[PDB]
Design a protein around this ligand. Structure first.
Ligand SMILES: Cc1cc2nc3c(=O)[nH]c(=O)nc-3n(C[C@H](O)[C@H](O)[C@H](O)COP(=O)(O)OP(=O)(O)OC[C@H]3O[C@@H](n4cnc5c(N)ncnc54)[C@H](O)[C@@H]3O)c2cc1C
Ligand SMILES: Cc1cc2nc3c(=O)[nH]c(=O)nc-3n(C[C@H](O)[C@H](O)[C@H](O)COP(=O)(O)OP(=O)(O)OC[C@H]3O[C@@H](n4cnc5c(N)ncnc54)[C@H](O)[C@@H]3O)c2cc1C
Ligand SMILES: [Zn+2]
Ligand SMILES: [Zn+2]
Lengths: 229, 229
């Protein structure tokens, strides 16, 4: 049996993102997987890293160091419940799919805050204690991203550069750093400009891909995969 | 005379980031510049891109598209006032400095939300009217970043890859996209690991650079600069 967490960051259930999230739930559910969705906007998920993320009293109340305090809070079971509820989902998951629209060559802020606050020292990594020594090894992650820009813009000599270039902070600096094996990204380019046929194509590619997702090997999450040449 | 906006993202006034923000204010003030700081945590700045960012009648109330609705709201003057407040600061500024700790090879979520919400269509870019034709043409931007990782970790053959690689979504995908000229980044590596003497040096290096900031040329914000290809 396999467990999947979908971390979903779109405001609108009728959106293209919503449909990709819903086809993932439908297909993984059909396969008999255990499926959980964190719908961040619906949850009004807190993005800001603040001292409210620690319950009780601080490791150093005179000078606030978010990383130190959250690490100590993790070890002492004193993190805020919104964070520990997400950590439980991640701990249980074999695969974490992130479904989002590209905002400024990155994730929407609400999802950036999920990464900042949920993947804390002691849970996802230690110092030292990262990349292959990270704490989420064994797990798979997958970025399912939609863009405004066309595929052709996202080439080496296109205006936006290769799409792999923007993946680096997410794939390498975040997911690989925490120990995930990273499956190849799903990138659904420019659905707002696409026709209905093409947008079905994209949804159906994704549903089709999901049928065999458990048979994929991860990408080599290297500086060479992203940039090289 | 020159106007500077510092967009600052750290929870703790006594932090290394707070020090670097203060020395910027002090130095630029000493030069006779006009200086404004947006202290995002102190402001409790809203990072989430939601339908609360538009106060008027939506273009399409059945299906919410944040980009479309914020573009129309900008033209109509129905955006939330926290957004308009920031836009005014940007509009008036000759130079925008971003002062932040690196979180997951990127900006903290509160600052991601500033980018997501403040830099809307009509204000920061138009389609057409992006990259060299972006609406913030003539303005300078500069990222002043602090890290956990050391400079050696952030080299082409270090565990983190070259520091320029993480700059791409920020400098190119965001700032250059909006028409900014990008000054070379200020990266203060690993202050937590550094000796007191080295920290004092990194602070003084920033102050000294600021003495001559108005004589600098921007970087060529290209894939070649960031990746060497
Ligand atoms: C703050 C901000 C920053 C951004 N920065 C960038 C950037 O850096 N780079 C970039 O490339 N883009 C950028 N974008 C654009 C953004 O990535 C796209 O607008 C987004 O990816 C579009 O996805 P969506 O789900 O919102 O599309 P939607 O508008 O929801 O949908 C696209 C179309 O598909 C339709 N649809 C929905 N479900 C289905 C279905 N099942 N079958 C067929 N059609 C369906 C919808 O009805 C709609 O007509 C930015 C946008 C914002 C708001
Ligand atoms: C969610 C999260 C994700 C992160 N992801 C990454 C990542 O991807 N990559 C990465 O490399 N790092 C990462 N980090 C680490 C983070 O970038 C560093 O912790 C941060 O940059 C350190 O800066 P600071 O201002 O917080 O340091 P501080 O801890 O405030 O300062 C360091 C020291 O300098 C002292 N100091 C302050 N002012 C002065 C002064 N004027 N002169 C001398 N000493 C002074 C302080 O008292 C302290 O002792 C992450 C951290 C978090 C919390
Ligand atoms: Zn990697
Ligand atoms: Zn550029």
């Amino acid at each position: 049996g396999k467990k999947v967490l979908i971390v979903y960051a779109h405001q609108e259930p009728k959106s293209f993102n919503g449909s990709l999230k819903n086809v993932a739930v439908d297909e993984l559910s059909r396969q008999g997987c255990t499926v959980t969705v964190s719908d961040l906007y619906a949850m009004n998920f807190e993005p800001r890293a603040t001292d409210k993320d620690i319950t009780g009293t601080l490791s150093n109340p005179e000078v606030f160091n978010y990383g130190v305090e959250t690490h100590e809070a993790y070890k002492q079971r004193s993190l805020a419940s919104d964070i520990t509820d997400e950590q439980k989902k991640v701990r249980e998951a074999d695969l974490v799919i992130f479904q989002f629209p590209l905002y400024w060559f990155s994730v929407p802020a609400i999802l950036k805050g999920w990464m900042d606050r949920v993947l804390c020292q002691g849970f996802a990594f230690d110092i030292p204690g990262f990349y292959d020594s990270g704490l989420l090894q064994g797990k798979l992650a997958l970025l399912s991203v939609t863009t405004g820009g066309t595929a052709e813009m996202y080439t080496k000599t296109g205006v936006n550069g290769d799409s792999r270039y923007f993946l680096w902070p997410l794939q390498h600096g975040t997911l690989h750093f925490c120990g995930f094996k990273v499956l190849a990204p799903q990138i659904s380019f420019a659905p707002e400009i696409a026709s209905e046929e093409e947008r079905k194509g994209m949804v159906a590619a994704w549903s089709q891909r999901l049928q065999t997702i458990w048979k994929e090997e991860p990408i080599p999450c290297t500086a060479h995969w992203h940039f090289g040449q």
